[PDB]
Amino acid sequence: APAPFADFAPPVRPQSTLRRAITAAYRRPETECLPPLVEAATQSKEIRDAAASTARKLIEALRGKHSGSGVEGLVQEYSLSSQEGVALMCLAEALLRIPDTATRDALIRDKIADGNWKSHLRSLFVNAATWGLVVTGKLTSTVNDRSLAAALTRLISRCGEPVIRRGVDMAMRMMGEQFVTGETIREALKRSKELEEKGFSYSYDMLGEAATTAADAERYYRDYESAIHAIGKASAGRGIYEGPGISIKLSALHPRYSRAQAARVMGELLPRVKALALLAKNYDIGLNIDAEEADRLELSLDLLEVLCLDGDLSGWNGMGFVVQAYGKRCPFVLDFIIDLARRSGRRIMVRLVKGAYWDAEIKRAQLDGLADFPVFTRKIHTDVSYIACAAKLLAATDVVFPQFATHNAQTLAAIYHMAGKDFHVGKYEFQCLHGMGEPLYEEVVGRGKLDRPCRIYAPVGTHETLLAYLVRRLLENGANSSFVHRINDPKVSIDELIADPVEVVRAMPVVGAKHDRIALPAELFGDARTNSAGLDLSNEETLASLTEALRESAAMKWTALPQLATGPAAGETRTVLNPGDHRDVVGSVTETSEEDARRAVRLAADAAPDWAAVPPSERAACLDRAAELMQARMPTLLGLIIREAGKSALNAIAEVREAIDFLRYYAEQTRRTLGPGHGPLGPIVCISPWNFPLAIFTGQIAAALVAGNPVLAKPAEETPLIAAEGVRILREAGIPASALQLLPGDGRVGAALVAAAETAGVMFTGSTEVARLIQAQLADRLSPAGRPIPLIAETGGQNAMIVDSSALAEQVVGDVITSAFDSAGQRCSALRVLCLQEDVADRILTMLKGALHELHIGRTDRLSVDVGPVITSEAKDNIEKHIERMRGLGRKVEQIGLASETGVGTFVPPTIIELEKLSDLQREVFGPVLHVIRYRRDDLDRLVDDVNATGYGLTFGLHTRLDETIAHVTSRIKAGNLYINRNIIGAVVGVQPFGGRGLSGTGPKAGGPLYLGRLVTTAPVPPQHSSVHTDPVLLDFAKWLDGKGARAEAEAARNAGSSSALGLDLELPGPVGERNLYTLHARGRILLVPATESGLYHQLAAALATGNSVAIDAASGLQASLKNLPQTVGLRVSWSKDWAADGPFAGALVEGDAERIRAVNKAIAALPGPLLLVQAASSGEIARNPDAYCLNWLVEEVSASINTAAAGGNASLMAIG
């Protein structure tokens, strides 16, 4: 049995002094990075004046030959709107997908020009975001396909065949010549002859998406290999400086190119790069390694080092490497490379770029809660960094070959004068991108200009593959701070364009201050609360420190005991085993006797007044202190969660962050709301599941405590140790022992707590079937006030994702693999049913199966493990029985093969099952099992019906670029957490308030603003909780009441209409590149069980004011109280004799004395299907209390999280950059 964490994340090699200096700079504060860059970038006054003069001459030439774009002349010639221009280019793109030119021309003449375009040509507008950038210069994340369809019809009906022909020829000139150098390497080489004669050189990239499968990585390998042959044949001995070279993207060559998979990278990716480099060496051409995301930088250095020390590659100086000046590590990376060049004797070609992933890096750091960004946040800082790094490179031209890749004439001029008068080919060069640098560099290359060479980066590929690259270039070019956008902006003077960033930064008040409008990850929520902090598992210092803390955590004698108010109690003790290796004993749990569980509730009841008397702000202060303790203890908490619950390090980090966020969110919500009149319920039993053994455990308890209730905490039997540690932390934070008792044990302990006479409320997260048993036990109970015992029951899901033909396969596959198999599918939010539009199903399924087989399953104390075990042998057996049933029915089953080492634990391999119908599934299967169904586009609405028809309603995902499909699907789906163009396992506290409907939950949502109000006897008004909209059926009913003479009830009805928050529509603060929306809708059909006429009118007013329909108990005998209803109200009203036949309901309102309420509550608990949130009142309470029925629980919360960067970039962030 291997020692825990003994092999957690060893680095590829011992970190040299130079490597450690890189890692140290990873997230260095921006104010600390800039001063040394300003110093290194400083030049003499004479040089600065000379550089400004050169820059002005270049810009004057650039603006002096600036002709209008072809698209702009087309828009002008035919008086096209922007949407017409975009629609025309989409049409042209489709028409160019027809190979036979005469067949295309006949389709244009005979069919398209005659208006009938929808008939003959997957949406025509799938790529309209790209063409929108071309036409408008602005990126819209989704496509308004109805606006585009209208615009296309309008323009064809107005201008006919001529505009179509012009659009086709315009698109042809762009896709085949402007953005790409050629569709094949041979075509690109043909097109390169013209500028090579004018003094340019080339570097070709067979660019595309990163590999998601082995097969795709192999395809990119053979594409690169064939291109090296073609380039080397064409080079014909010109060498690495005067002749062409290739650029490669390491992520194209292996599907798991990451620090977490460093061993596979060195074992599998490195030999492939070596083989390509050997071929480049034989032809004597350049081979440049492109730079990608910040978390791949240092990993790529390990490949660079091995390759440069490999004697088989000696004699060749063509190996090249990109470094990104927007990165805080850039000068230290250059120090490392220059030293490696010296050690190896290889003159490394160093391509200095500013950086292509800026908006993505901002979003990633925010999502991950990291200390700071790995890139600068002011564009001028990147410019200073670039010039400072150029100075370092120009001092080392004997050992490296600097390649200054930029389109900025000011940057260029500064380096041109920095480099001085001595020049020879091979000393350094400039570089640019095909189709955007030639205007500038035709003023540079050649003895009649500056006589400095330029290498053109030449993308090669079909139009299909060119889209992702094209979006980035156009988004970049239209960016607020972009040199290209500013040189085209007539309100920007040449004086502004030639301003020296070094001197501008030097004179700022705080040199290197972060951008004012970009929040550090800790500050995402501003004054409301401090964001939890994560850990960077790409940082070697973090990994080394975490390795030690994790090992230390495994040496601790973790215990869980019954912690009663009076002290620990004795009980039956057993060991807690690691689910991934039962030989690894994690701790010991002493479980609670049923006698002591009953005793604990009595102790809580006796302690309830004292805890209630602690002022809410001081209760909140306890939660904030517990959050601080959990943050500081995160590494140790990670280690415990990893071994006790079978979680990977990434999942444990997220788990502890979520616990911290719950604590701080409920503390702040308390400070915003709770006062003396919001009395506690009393002892609350918190029963929690194994699968989020710290986060959900902490969230329920924290909310109950801060609302003023003493808590009986009953953790899942599988995961008591982290629970006991959470209670220990809460007690250390100031929660009295009498206010928080821990009762380890199985469901019998949970049941003993639920049944205890003094139990005043139950918070349950777990399976629907156990929730139903708790509901039944509570159905014969009332509070001392004669009201139902509140139950929050958050239960299972059958979560779907719908994918149409507009979605990007690689994005879908990544989000599907994550959503379905993260934590071995043991998230309530996990993706269970993937729904693929028929036309793209085969391609996505092939990619999905390929990506499945790249997952590493094993004991989770290794960074390289993606998917851990399932929690128990019983869970394993349940899951495997489901798989074998499906397989026995003839369904296609794909499974990863497991390693022999999994035999010591309980593992289920990630599994894909192809279903015929959604009805093949009957219940949640809580494991790593993805089901796949296919649908025809016209059946989308029926498919949404089928998804809703399971009765669940927890998480739901949609991948589409099309606004009509977003509006359709999101309006018809009935689930609590929606996710657009991203994974569906997001539950960020206060950002995606989490919780569903139907079989998935009662609500209110955890991590949302209605939660605390369920835990007090009188609910406060939550922050931002109001709506100016009034339900119109409510209004009709209030008028009907006035017509019947029920004047008091009509007034109460109008008041409910105003008090209702139905229609609340908020955007919640969160990370950039995401829109997080929170809305209040009707719940559905509410069961009304009235006793009196006035009671019925009040119940109906409450239900209608919150948008609901109703089924009224026919046994009430009150049918004559609703004569002559307006049709609008009658449509919402049904009469029910057999309640179980007329459901499912979404809540209930009951009127009666205590024995009537108890009887009705028992009948309601017996109804099939969802647990119903029941509110009850006496006739007298209805007369006395306008809030007898609380409208908070008659609406349904919906969270929607939209990935607005999904089209390829963040438009709003580029507009402030």
Ligand SMILES: Cc1cc2c(cc1C)N(C1SCCS1)c1c([nH]c(=O)[nH]c1=O)N2C[C@H](O)[C@H](O)[C@H](O)COP(=O)(O)OP(=O)(O)OC[C@H]1O[C@@H](n2cnc3c(N)ncnc32)[C@H](O)[C@@H]1O
């Ligand atoms: C010419 C070339 C370029 C590249 C490659 C090869 C060649 C030959 N390869 C390639 S491999 C696949 C992609 S291309 C390559 C690239 N990129 C990459 O990462 N890896 C790679 O391998 N590029 C793209 C460059 O990094 C860069 O985006 C552009 O050249 C634009 O910069 P500029 O001309 O200096 O304009 P500029 O003066 O307007 O500056 C724009 C830049 O400033 C930065 N910026 C903008 N806003 C900022 C803010 N608020 N805070 C801080 N910084 C900000 C950001 O980097 C932005 O791109």
Ligand SMILES: NC(=O)c1ccc[n+]([C@@H]2O[C@H](COP(=O)([O-])OP(=O)(O)OC[C@H]3O[C@@H](n4cnc5c(N)ncnc54)[C@H](O)[C@@H]3O)[C@@H](O)[C@H]2O)c1
């Ligand atoms: N909606 C959400 O937010 C959410 C979140 C996480 C998990 N879940 C659901 O939780 C389930 C998996 O977690 P689990 O396996 O621990 O759930 P579970 O129902 O098996 O047990 C949950 C808790 O109930 C207790 N329990 C069992 N029987 C009981 C009884 N008769 N009376 C009182 N308590 C009893 C258990 O000891 C445990 O503490 C899944 O269905 C998952 O979807 C829902």
Ligand SMILES: [Mg+2]
């Ligand atoms: Mg269970």
